[PDB]
Amino acid sequence: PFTMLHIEFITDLGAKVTVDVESADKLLDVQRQYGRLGWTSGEVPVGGYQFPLENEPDFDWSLIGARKWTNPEEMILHRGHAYRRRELEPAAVKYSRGAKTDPEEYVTLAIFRGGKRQERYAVP
Amino acid sequence: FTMLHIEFITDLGAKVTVDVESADKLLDVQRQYGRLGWTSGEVPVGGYQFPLENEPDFDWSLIGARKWTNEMILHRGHAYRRREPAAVKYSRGAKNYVTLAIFRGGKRQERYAVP
Amino acid sequence: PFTMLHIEFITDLGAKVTVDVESADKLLDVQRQYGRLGWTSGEVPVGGYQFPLENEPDFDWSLIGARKWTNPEMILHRGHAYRRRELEPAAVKYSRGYVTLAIFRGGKRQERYAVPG
Amino acid sequence: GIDPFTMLHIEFITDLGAKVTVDVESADKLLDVQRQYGRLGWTSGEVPVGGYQFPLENEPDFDWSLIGARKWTNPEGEEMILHRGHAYRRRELEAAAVKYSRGAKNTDPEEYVTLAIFRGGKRQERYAVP
Amino acid sequence: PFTMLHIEFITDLGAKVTVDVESADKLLDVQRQYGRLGWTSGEVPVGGYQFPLENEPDFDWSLIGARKWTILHRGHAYRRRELEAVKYSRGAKNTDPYVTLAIFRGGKRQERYAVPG
Numbered sequence: 001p002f003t004m005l006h007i008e009f010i011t012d013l014g015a016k017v018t019v020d021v022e023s024a025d026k027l028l029d030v031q032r033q034y035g036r037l038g039w040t041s042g043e044v045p046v047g048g049y050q051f052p053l054e055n056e057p058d059f060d061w062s063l064i065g066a067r068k069w070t071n072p073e074e075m076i077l078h079r080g081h082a083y084r085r086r087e088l089e090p091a092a093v094k095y096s097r098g099a100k101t102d103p104e105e106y107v108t109l110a111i112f113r114g115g116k117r118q119e120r121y122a123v124p
Numbered sequence: 125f126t127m128l129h130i131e132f133i134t135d136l137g138a139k140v141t142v143d144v145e146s147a148d149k150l151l152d153v154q155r156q157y158g159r160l161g162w163t164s165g166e167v168p169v170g171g172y173q174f175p176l177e178n179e180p181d182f183d184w185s186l187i188g189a190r191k192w193t194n195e196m197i198l199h200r201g202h203a204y205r206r207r208e209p210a211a212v213k214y215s216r217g218a219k220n221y222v223t224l225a226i227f228r229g230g231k232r233q234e235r236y237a238v239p
Numbered sequence: 240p241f242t243m244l245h246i247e248f249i250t251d252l253g254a255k256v257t258v259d260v261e262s263a264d265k266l267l268d269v270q271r272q273y274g275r276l277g278w279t280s281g282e283v284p285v286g287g288y289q290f291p292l293e294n295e296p297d298f299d300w301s302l303i304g305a306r307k308w309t310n311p312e313m314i315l316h317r318g319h320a321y322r323r324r325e326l327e328p329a330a331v332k333y334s335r336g337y338v339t340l341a342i343f344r345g346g347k348r349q350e351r352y353a354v355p356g
Numbered sequence: 357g358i359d360p361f362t363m364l365h366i367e368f369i370t371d372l373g374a375k376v377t378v379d380v381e382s383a384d385k386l387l388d389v390q391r392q393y394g395r396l397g398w399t400s401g402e403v404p405v406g407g408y409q410f411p412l413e414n415e416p417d418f419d420w421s422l423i424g425a426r427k428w429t430n431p432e433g434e435e436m437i438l439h440r441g442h443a444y445r446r447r448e449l450e451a452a453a454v455k456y457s458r459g460a461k462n463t464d465p466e467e468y469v470t471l472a473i474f475r476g477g478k479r480q481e482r483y484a485v486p
Numbered sequence: 487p488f489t490m491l492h493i494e495f496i497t498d499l500g501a502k503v504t505v506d507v508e509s510a511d512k513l514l515d516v517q518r519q520y521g522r523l524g525w526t527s528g529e530v531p532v533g534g535y536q537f538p539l540e541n542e543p544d545f546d547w548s549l550i551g552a553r554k555w556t557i558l559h560r561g562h563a564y565r566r567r568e569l570e571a572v573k574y575s576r577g578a579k580n581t582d583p584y585v586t587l588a589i590f591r592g593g594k595r596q597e598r599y600a601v602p603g
Binding site for chain 3: 363370372373374375376377378379380441
């Protein structure tokens with residue numbers, strides 16, 4: 001009746017678009033839907049997002065407006081940027097790129113370490 | 125008709141605004157999404173300032189925090205330790221000391237407590 | 240029909256809350272209402288607010304989320320305390336340890352700024 | 357291409373520095389709302405670096421309430437433009453332009469700062485006083 | 487009682503105006519409409535927008551509030567340059583923290599980015 005949510009995006013054209021959501025349990029569906037187009041919401045936290053380690057092999061990258069993509073090398077595309085996969089030995093997996101256009105030798109998109117697995121982060 | 129609206133940053137960093145029916149329900153909605161790790165607004169320079177008598181039973185979900193023993197306070201993938209007019213401080217020290225909350229002075233406020 | 244206004248506050252808990260208003264002539268009522276709770280809207284302008292001189296003795300401090308408070312007479316605004324100062328045009332200022340909250344000088348009196356009565 | 361049935365919303369900063377957003381029925385009523393609250397001294401958005409840019413043929417009868425300003429003659433006898441507790445003086449520029457600006461101070465990070473420049477362009481009637 | 491979209495613009499008078507949109511498939515029409523008036527949405531990404539290379543000869547500049555002028559964007563003028571990719575950039579300025587607008591390079595050509603018809 002008035003139990004509505006609103007999510008604010010930045011689009012592929014850089015436009016500032018807010019999308020209405022019917023209720024709380026439909027929020028993630030909306031996030032994947034517009035993330036599939038390359039739209040993002042909010043800023044990347046300093047040092048990149050932090051996710052559980054057991055969520056790495058099947059993480060839905062559309063939750064943050066990213067997609068997998070292969071070169072003449074398997075990469076992750078996020079805002080006309082490409083991130084490479086790294087292994088750290090607790091175990092961890094980082095996704096980074098070279099700095100510089102350099103708002104303060106590497107800047108990370110996401111780090112997978114520790115924590116307990118969360119199902120909602122996985123590809124349905 | 126007329127409502128209220130509160131703006132959050134979620135666990136996925138998303139910018140989500142939540143509708144509220146009326147003023148007497150703002151805190152209920154704050155505790156609710158605070159329990160999920162959602163925050164609203166910025167931490168004031170020098171940390172929040174609460175009355176001294178509100179320390180032993182402060183509802184940390186009001187600011188998106190949770191107690192966690194390894195006894196620490198988790199607020200955004202950050203951990204704060206307890207430290208001791210008298211006063212109590214919750215702090216750390218990184219590179220991006222920085223305090224989350226200070227309890228000192230003031231008269232008590234029952235709305236700040238765990239229901 | 241299409242006559243709503245929306246005012247954005249920062250609460251006592253630092254939360255970011257926007258309040259709906261029925262129409263323009265009910266805006267000040269909403270400002271005093273949430274102002275008494277300590278909620279503020281917007282930023283304090285550099286050099287403090289500027290009000291007419293004849294509005295000093297009876298200014299509604301709730302219009303900016305402030306309140307009178309005497310310790311063993313101050314103005315409380317966000318866990319900060321401002322002291323009263325005089326100057327001799329004749330101007331009254333509220334200062335603390337210098338950063339100012341409000342300066343009262345010149346101008347013609349404005350009725351809506353006074354405590355209702 | 358204007359849609360008759362979709363609402364708009366405009367965000368102001370008031371005389372008390374409060375953040376207030378105003379609802380508008382449709383696109384064709386936006387200007388009416390801008391003049392109304394502009395006459396009270398409310399502003400929307402920031403002054404673009406180097407000041408606003410308007411067509412030259414709009415200077416003699418520009419509605420200053422469109423940006424929350426007003427004309428004001430002062431004790432010394434000079435005609436000024438008031439915008440947010442600031443006063444701007446009228447200057448002319450011969451090759452042709454017209455400039456409204458004031459001296460810069462300490463509490464102002466970039467010596468002059470300008471409010472509006474009238475130069476070139478073709479006339480637009482919506483900028484004029486009704 | 488339905489679910490819409492909302493797009494936030496900065497106008498020709500610098501005002502902050504948000505426009506309602508009926509549904510997702512009508513967003514583009516709204517963008518072209520107010521873009522034709524010089525309204526923009528969001529900020530120009532550092533290093534400028536990035537498009538597919540095959541979208542250059544018939545790009546609808548109204549999608550970002552620009553217009554052809556034998557490119558005008560925000561009272562600024564940008565010149566065409568070739569790379570051997572196509573670059574649109576202007577000189578420096580004493581009022582900005584070469585600065586490029588759009589860069590066409592690689593990628594697969596996209597439907598909607600073209601002037602309709």
